[PDB]
Design a protein around this ligand. Structure first.
Ligand SMILES: [Mg+2]
Ligand SMILES: [Mg+2]
Ligand SMILES: [Mg+2]
Length: 248
């Protein structure tokens, strides 16, 4: 019926976008920490704001300071405080810059941005098992962003169908910002899996190594979800297996 895969991931799935069919599921209903996968919801809300004439790509914003030393940040590697919304959006999606994400959320709704993330989750049809806590996906006061592979499929599918141009950014192995700095994608499978054009990585000790992949072949798009794989390499090895199933 559905194949017998041996994955590192503790929860994993791959789905057909066209009709929603699950082609493989493992712990698909299990609530899991999702870390920087949260940035897909922040991206959705940024893209909505621009379409709705509520945000401009050329607004210049100041990077928020992170109190977490170990968190990936745009400021740490550039020492530049002020960036365009375009460049912050690119940094968030490409290198998983937590400060860029927090800065965008602040601009959109101040301290109430997590409430807007969860409002959008509901509006889009995600289940009660999903809760966002921050624009970046960094923990807040001991609370973690969590979801399921089923809900992450829905978020990713809605993001891609509503804003197909997101893949213009997530398909790039390197992004040259408008400021000038070049940012490197965390998606190591770009150029390794034919048709793969997204979507987003995540990693903390608690969440393990995570990846939402998407690829289109012959007019058929699939979305793969990998949560809590054991190494960075393993999340992508798992994704290779899921993509094989997805296009079988
Ligand atoms: Mg809208
Ligand atoms: Mg759009
Ligand atoms: Mg663990």
């Amino acid at each position: 019926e559905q194949p017998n895969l041996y994955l590192s991931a503790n929860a994993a799935a791959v789905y057909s976008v066209e009709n929603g069919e699950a082609l493989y599921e493992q712990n698909a209903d299990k609530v899991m920490p999702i870390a920087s996968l949260s940035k897909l919801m922040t991206a959705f809300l940024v893209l909505e704001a621009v379409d709705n004439n509520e945000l401009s790509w050329d607004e210049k914003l100041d990077l928020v300071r992170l109190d977490d030393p170990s968190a990936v940040s745009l400021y740490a590697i550039t020492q530049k405080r002020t960036w365009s919304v375009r460049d912050l959006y690119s940094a968030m999606l490409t290198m998983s810059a937590n400060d860029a994400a927090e800065t965008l959320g602040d601009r959109l709704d101040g301290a109430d941005f997590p409430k807007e993330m969860n409002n959008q989750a509901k509006k889009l049809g995600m289940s009660s098992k999903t809760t966002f806590v921050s624009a970046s996906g960094l923990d807040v006061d001991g609370k973690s962003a969590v979801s399921t592979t089923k809900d992450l499929f829905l978020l990713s599918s809605k993001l891609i169908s509503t804003h197909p141009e997101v893949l213009e950014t997530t398909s790039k192995p390197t992004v040259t910002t408008d400021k000038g700095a070049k940012l490197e994608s965390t998606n190591d499978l770009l150029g390794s899996i034919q048709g793969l054009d997204g979507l987003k990585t995540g990693f903390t000790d608690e969440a393990g190594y995570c990846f939402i992949g998407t690829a289109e072949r012959g007019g058929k798009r699939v979305i793969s979800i990998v949560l809590d794989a054991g190494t960075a390499e393993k999340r992508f090895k798992d994704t290779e297996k899921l993509m094989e199933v997805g296009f079988k």
